[PDB]
Amino acid sequence: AATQTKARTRSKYEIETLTGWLLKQPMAGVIDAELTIVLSSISLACKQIASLVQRAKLDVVSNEVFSSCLRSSGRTGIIASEEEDVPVAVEESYSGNYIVVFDPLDGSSNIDAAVSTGSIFGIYSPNDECIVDSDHDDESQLSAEEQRCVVNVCQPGDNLLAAGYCMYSSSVIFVLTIGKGVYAFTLDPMYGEFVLTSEKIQIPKAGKIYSFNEGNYKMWPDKLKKYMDDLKEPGESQKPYSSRYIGSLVGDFHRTLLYGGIYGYPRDAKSKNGKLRLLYECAPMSFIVEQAGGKGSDGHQRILDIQPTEIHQRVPLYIGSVEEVEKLEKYLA
């Protein structure tokens, strides 16, 4: 016996929920189910952000949800973002054993006439965090703001536990990883739940697609100009690299991740230090494809070795498949 019928949709016979697997997983780790509450909670905030996006300042209130969805998880002892001019997030009594940075959306402009946006999170477990001085409390009245001590370290990216993003576009696929695989989930709209959509989606080896903002070409160095103008001149009877540039970093980093290729953004108008930030979004996505196989380098080296030394500094990013990442590097050298 093995029938069904004409639903051609409702056939969730094996509903492997985000939670289902996300819970069937922690059965191995001394993270005392503190992770789960956080990852699962991020799930919550993303599930809501997906609705803000769609609608009924987007990024400067999507952080407001983070807190609302994490003042319960001691794991996010303290949390973070991009939009704000103050590192606060939750005060005192709700502490844990890790930290998680959250990037509301992915681009001030991006949103205006968007078609794709997302949020990029990466969880850092400073095995020897904060440690500054005694922790004060009790007194009250905080006119000239709520005192606090130090603004803890800038973890690098090799001691990066869990990373992922959630692309609000066409679907709202939750994508996350950990030191044992890459996983993707679609947001089944009706029952508002993130079903497991893909088990360890490994990037293919030949990725014949190129995502670069040629528009500001007369700004890329000649050496780099040698990458652009040359990849669209095959040189043998074969397909040329088709270009796709949606705009959004997630939008683009998801097209690539599933389809090979190489997305990049580099030293141009701004300054050769980069454009995209380092710890807050270049790191969290360089970790994913790293598992998936691909590579991600600033032409010189990989991007989860460089330990940032400030909360904003830009870095050029080039990323996609191995062969197409190691390739381009033989140009800027």
Added chain:
Amino acid sequence: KARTRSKYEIETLTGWLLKQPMAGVIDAELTIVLSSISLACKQIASLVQRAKLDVVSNEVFSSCLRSSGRTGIIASEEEDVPVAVEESYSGNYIVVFDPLDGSSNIDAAVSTGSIFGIYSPNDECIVDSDHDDESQLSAEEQRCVVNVCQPGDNLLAAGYCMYSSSVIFVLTIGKGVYAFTLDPMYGEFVLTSEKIQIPKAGKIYSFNEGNYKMWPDKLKKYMDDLKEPGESQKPYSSRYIGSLVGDFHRTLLYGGIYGYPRDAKSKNGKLRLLYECAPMSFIVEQAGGKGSDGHQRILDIQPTEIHQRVPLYIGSVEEVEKLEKYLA
């Protein structure tokens, strides 16, 4: 909420659609189908939202119309035999409907779109006729079901529906384009922006630059004067999503030029002359700029064949004019 947001939830789609007849004696049937379309799209929308597809979107549209009707006939992307849903159900409408567009990168999923066009047929005739496997040889003296051959003159309304990050429907019936955002929660097409007018200047281009080394030289130089400024000004920024509707949408709102051009292999365009160039032309032409195949404005091209493919360029007039020289 999310910026403007709720600000708009007053007077849905049908609010306006009933406002049109009340405000312009519209053949009241146009409001039944222009409505079975808001629904028919909403369906494929949560089907595109994930929850076989190229044809399901038709199989929705069909039923979601085969019923009511008002039109008389409907068609598609692959139906070289315009599905005449009974000559019996109507008389004065033909609403070609393109299930989706850019049917490939939907497998990963970022954007997509359904497109359509109401054609009031001055010409009619019936249908039937599909002669089956029996006795006789070649001599096709046939054309099959068509008449899909007269834009500009017959396009009464036109619009597309974008499925991505929002499900913004967009439509025009002569007096300006009007865009509609779908309220997920309380599933209602809420009027968002009215009388959209695409930007007079605009610096955004969307071409498949990746197959540049395969276009006519008259054009290939154009590509370079987008990269290499001269008069000393702002650079021309660029962006290709992968689906017409996303690009066109992104163009109708931000400004630019867009156009899969003709090259060695596709000597004649790609995107079809009726099905996806004409309905999409009458919008950009109702929103400010112009649409054209390099030389002539796209609405003069008497559709003279089946899947007639034809080069297309679309967006702000100023821009489709800079390439007016470069073209030829």
Added chain:
Amino acid sequence: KARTRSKYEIETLTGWLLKQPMAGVIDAELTIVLSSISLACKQIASLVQRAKLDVVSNEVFSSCLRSSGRTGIIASEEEDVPVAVEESYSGNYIVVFDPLDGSSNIDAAVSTGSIFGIYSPNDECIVDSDHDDESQLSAEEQRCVVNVCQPGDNLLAAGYCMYSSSVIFVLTIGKGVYAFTLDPMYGEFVLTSEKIQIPKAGKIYSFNEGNYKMWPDKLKKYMDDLKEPGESQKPYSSRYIGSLVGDFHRTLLYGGIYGYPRDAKSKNGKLRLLYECAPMSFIVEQAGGKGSDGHQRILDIQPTEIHQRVPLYIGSVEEVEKLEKYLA
């Protein structure tokens, strides 16, 4: 192959509602507001799942509507002594919407349907422009109301939407009643019950038995009666949820009686005339049922003044004349 309908559409409310103007010459004014209403209910509905209700529901109905081209005034419970809709909107039709059904029960595990009734000022009134603060939720006087207070000679359509474990929209414009359930998939009301008629031998009764003594001499006997199965046959079972719409809804589809007798809380009861009792009695006449206040038929009892409480006896004929057989 078992598709057929399993990919159809199923004639939705917005569908059904448009076809009506197809049959008439109505420029869609009534048709505009019915949809404007229907939406107010969807949010007010979806809000009830807890995603001050009585208050919000009233703004939620102000927006979707008020701005409707055909109103000649509109209203909402607490608004003590009239409401007028700004010239800029105008028209004639008036719609009495009393937000929710009760202000105590829900929290339990009940229901809370909303109620509407579009009166049509066979003649009409209102004031002009100006405005002088009136920003308080507390202004009322002896202003010769009347406007809002429109006789049962007017009332041309009526209905409610029950927010139980399934948002049901039921309404009768004047050719039988119709119900449309709300399918959270397609976010739209699928016509589900077409043309209703309550059953005659209404073998069920809903009565707030608890306030027994309060009841007058003649009613209490009738009560022990419905319990002591007269001739020695079938007893009347009980069910009472605690809210108008809900108790009245099983009373519509399924037979029986529901009522709010003129008891010790002074010769009146707890249900108002124009608001809760006038619409509900109109749905029943058409639902092959009957509405009685005790003394005469509610549907034609002069409203006289505001808030005019009137005990209600609502249900299938036979099973209503019965207690009505207690006079003279």
Added chain:
Amino acid sequence: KARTRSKYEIETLTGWLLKQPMAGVIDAELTIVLSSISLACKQIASLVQRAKLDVVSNEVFSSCLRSSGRTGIIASEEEDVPVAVEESYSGNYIVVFDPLDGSSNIDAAVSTGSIFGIYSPNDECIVDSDHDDESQLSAEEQRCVVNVCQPGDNLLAAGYCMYSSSVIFVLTIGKGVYAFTLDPMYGEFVLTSEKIQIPKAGKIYSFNEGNYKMWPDKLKKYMDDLKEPGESQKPYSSRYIGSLVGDFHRTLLYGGIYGYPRDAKSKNGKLRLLYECAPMSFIVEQAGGKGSDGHQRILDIQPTEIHQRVPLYIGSVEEVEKLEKYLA
């Protein structure tokens, strides 16, 4: 004004479900098999709300439990016989699942719900035991059946989900009755009310009064003292939905008495023992109330078959003893 969003420290069932089973021994097994019960309950409500949805509700259930191999066969509502889950999913623990209670409301449009129970077979055996009226002795039984039977003192977690105007989720376990109001929009169970308990008072009775000419001469008298009491005063209110979970839920909250007395049909009364009245009584118990079959508590019975009904009376520690005083 803010009060719904303004909570902070927000929790979804998952949160709570791990939060406790982290601090208090339990985790893995139980948590998940309660989570995939949360989910099964979100997935079922939609069938009620409308996507004849009884059998289906059991199959939805099996699925959302199969990959949680800590439960064996379970004779659940209407089911003919408990099925084992292909080994490996070695379920050393048994849960009884009750899809839709009040066999009627589902087509009647009104409150309905699901009730479950987690029995930890202190004496390992979670295997089938086919029972189809064969033989054994020529007389009657001697030995125990299916094991499914597990006394109320040894049932760890039990709760119910109400699909009424809201999908409130009530659960209790070792501490109290917690309730989570499914957030319609995003699909998550939020905790609304921590460790609560009835209010001792109980001005609400909820029995099927209309069946009066039938109850025992001792209960029959009792009802009259509810309507016309000693020192009289503020009478009782008779709020009765009829659906077992709706009644039990307005009760557990507000406070009152709710009962299914002995009747005519047979001393059973109707409601089943460990499938329906046992967990409800187990919950209402720690919720502070009391539950009993008039003269003896439910958390002190164990039948000799699948369907051994039992009169049920549940309500506050007061109301219950009151009717208990009419016990000779």
